[PDB]
Amino acid sequence: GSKILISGGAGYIGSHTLRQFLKTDHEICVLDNLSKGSKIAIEDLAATRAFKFFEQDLSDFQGVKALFEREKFDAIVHFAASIEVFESMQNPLKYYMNNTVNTTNLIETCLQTGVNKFIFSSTAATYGEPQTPVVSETSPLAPINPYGRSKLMSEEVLRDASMANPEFKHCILRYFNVAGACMDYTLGQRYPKATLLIKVAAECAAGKRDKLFIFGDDYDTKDGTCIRDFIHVDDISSAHLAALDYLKENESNVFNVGYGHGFSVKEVIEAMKKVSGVDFKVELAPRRAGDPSVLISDASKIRNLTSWQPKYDDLELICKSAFDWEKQC
Amino acid sequence: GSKILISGGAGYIGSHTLRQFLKTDHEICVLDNLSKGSKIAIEDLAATRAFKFFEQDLSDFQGVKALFEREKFDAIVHFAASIEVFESMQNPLKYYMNNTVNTTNLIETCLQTGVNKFIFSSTAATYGEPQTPVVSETSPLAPINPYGRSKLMSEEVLRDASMANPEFKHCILRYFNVAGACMDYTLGQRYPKATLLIKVAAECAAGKRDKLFIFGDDYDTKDGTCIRDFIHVDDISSAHLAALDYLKENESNVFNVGYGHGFSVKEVIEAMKKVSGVDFKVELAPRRAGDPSVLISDASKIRNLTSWQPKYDDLELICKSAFDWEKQC
Ligand SMILES: NC(=O)c1ccc[n+]([C@@H]2O[C@H](COP(=O)([O-])OP(=O)(O)OC[C@H]3O[C@@H](n4cnc5c(N)ncnc54)[C@H](O)[C@@H]3O)[C@@H](O)[C@H]2O)c1
Ligand SMILES: NC(=O)c1ccc[n+]([C@@H]2O[C@H](COP(=O)([O-])OP(=O)(O)OC[C@H]3O[C@@H](n4cnc5c(N)ncnc54)[C@H](O)[C@@H]3O)[C@@H](O)[C@H]2O)c1
C-alpha cells in the first residue's frame, strides 16, 4: 500500500494512530524526536509489524528535506507539535517555533518532494471563544492564545499551498480535548476551564488533585451543569485514517472531529467515580461568569463526507481510558 | 551611542535608513545576505562612517544566534524580507519561509539576547481589500495574499512576544508602495493593481513596458482617476528612526506611514512624463472590476504620537526618485 509518514508518531495520539495504521496494508514510517514521545511504545509496536522509525527533529530542516527526498512519501499525517495553552501564554516563541515554523518547512518540503496528501492535526482552539454552543467549521477563526494562533497560522499556510499547487491536498482536523492526554501545565491550575473536565476528574480520581469544583448547576442544560466536548484517543486516531481515505478522490477540506454531542460535568464526575472506584471530593460553586453552558464541535460534516465511525462514544470507557492514562502521566 | 542592527540594510529602504542612522551617534550594524541588496551601496557608505557589516542569512538560525550572543544589540530595525505580492501568489512558501519563519527565529533570538527594541517593517497589505477609502491602524487585518499574510503573522508573534515579555518593545510600521523599489518578478505581471502605478509608470518611461493603462476616468475624484498612496524612500526611512525614538519613552505600538493624502493615476502619469521627458504610451480603458476609487493610509496617528515629519511630499520628487532608481534595478 501507500507510503505514509506519521510525524509525532511516538506521542499519545500519534502512537494510537500508528497502531491502527499497522493493521492496514500501507507502508508506514514514523518521525519523532522523542521529546514527549516514548521509545518503548515504538519498540512494542515494531514487534507487531515492521515500520521505519526516524528519530529526527523537525527543526533540522536539511534533515527533513533529505528524509523526504530519500523516502518519497505519498502522505504525511502531522501530529508533532507543542500542545499546552497555558505554556504558550508564558512562552509564545516556543509555540511559534515548534508548531508554525517547523510545520512551514514541512509543507515546503512536501511540495518539493511530491508529498501531495497532508493530514494536519489542528485544534478547536482555532475558534477561540465561539459565539455559538455548537461550533461548525465555518465559525470565525479567532484564537485567543499563542497555541491557537500557531495552529491557525499553519492552517493558512496549508490553504495557500493548495491554492498555488492544485495537486497538493490537505485535510485539517480540529477537535477539543482528548481523554487521557498528559499535560504538564494542568495540575498547577487550581480552577481550569471546563474543556479540561475529564483531565481534572482523572487527576482527582488518581489522588493528584485534592478537589473538583462544579462552577454552576443551574444552566439551561439537561442536568444544570456545563456541557463540553471530549473524545476517545482511538476515535480521534481513526478519524485521521478516515481523513487520509477521504483525500483519495476528494479535494482539500477541514473537519471538526467529535461525537456531535457533549458530556456534562455531572456525567463525567459520576462516570469517573464509578470507573475508578474513587469517591474524590467535589464541591458546588457559583457560575463562573463568561462560561458558556454548552461548547461542542458540530461533527455533521465529517459524518457526511467520510467513512469515520467512532466506536468509543461511551463515557465510562472514556473516563476509564483517561484514568488509566492519568496514572501513567 | 546605542547599538543598532539593521537587517536588510543593503536593500532599498534599509540602505537609505542606514544612511540616516550614520548621522546619529548610534553604533550601527548591518545584516544582509545580499540576495537582492547591493554590497556596492554598503561600501560607499562604509567610507562615510564606519559600520559593522554581517553578510549573514536569516535562515541560518544558529549563525543568527551566535552573532546576537556576541554583539548584544540594543535594538533592531527589521527590513529583511521578500516583498512581491505577485510572486507570493505563485510561491507562497518562499514568503512564509523568508518572512514569517525567519522573523520568528529573529524574535526568539532577540528575546534570548536582550534586544528589547524591535522596529518591524510591515505593510498596508495587512489590510487586504478595505471597506473604506482611508485605512487607519484599527482597520480590520484581513490580508488576501500570502505576502500580506506572512507579514501579519509576524506582527502577531511580536504582539505575543511583548505580552509575555513586558521588557520587549516593538514598533510596527505599515505603509503602501515606496517609489523607486525594485520588483523584478512583477515586471512579468501584465496588469498590476493601481497601488503599483508609480512603478509601472517608471517602467514605461524607462522603456521596460511598452504601454500603461488608465482603467476608468469617471470616478468621484478630483480628476476622475483612481487615487493611491505613494511615499518617498527617504520619508519612510525617517519614519523608522522616529519609531525607534518613540520606543524610548513609550510602549509598543503600530503606525501607518503616509502623507495623509494620495496621488491620482493621472497626476502620477503626467509627473513621470515631466521628470523623465519620455512621452510613453498611455491607453484609456473602462473601470477595472474590484477597483476602489480611493485607497490611502490614515497617517494622523504617527503625526500626533511621534516626531516624524515628511520632507519630500512632492509628486515630482517622488517620480524623479522612482525614475532614477528604475534604471538601477
Ligand atoms: N487533547 C489533545 O491532546 C489534543 C487536542 C486537540 C489537538 N491536538 C493535536 O494533536 C497532536 C498530538 O497531540 P498529542 O496529545 O499526541 O501530543 P503529544 O505530545 O503526545 O505528541 C506530540 C509528539 O510529537 C513529538 N514532537 C514534538 N516536537 C517535535 C519536533 N520538533 N520534532 C520531532 N518530533 C516532535 C513529541 O515528541 C511527541 O511524541 C498535536 O498536534 C496537537 O496540537 C491534541
Ligand atoms: N518597497 C515597498 O514598496 C514596500 C512597501 C511596504 C513595505 N515594505 C517592506 O520594507 C522592507 C524592505 O523593503 P525594500 O523595498 O527595501 O526591499 P529590498 O528587497 O530592497 O530589501 C530587503 C533586503 O533584505 C535582504 N534579505 C532578504 N532576505 C534575507 C535573508 N533571509 N537574510 C538576510 N538578508 C535578507 C535582501 O538581500 C535585501 O537587501 C520589507 O520588509 C518590505 O516588506 C516595502
Automatic annotation (TrEMBL), chains A, B:
Keywords for this entry? Carbohydrate metabolism, Isomerase, NAD, Nucleotide-binding
GO terms of biological process kind? galactose catabolic process via UDP-galactose, Leloir pathway
Pathway it works in: Carbohydrate metabolism; galactose metabolism
Catalyses which reaction?
Answer: UDP-alpha-D-glucose = UDP-alpha-D-galactose
Q: Any S-S bridges, and between which cysteines?
A: C182-C329
Q: Name one GO molecular function term.
A: nucleotide binding
Is the keyword DNA-binding assigned to this protein? no
Identify this protein by name: UDP-glucose 4-epimerase
Recorded source organism is Campylobacter jejuni subsp. jejuni serotype O:2 (strain ATCC 700819 / NCTC 11168)
The encoding gene is gne
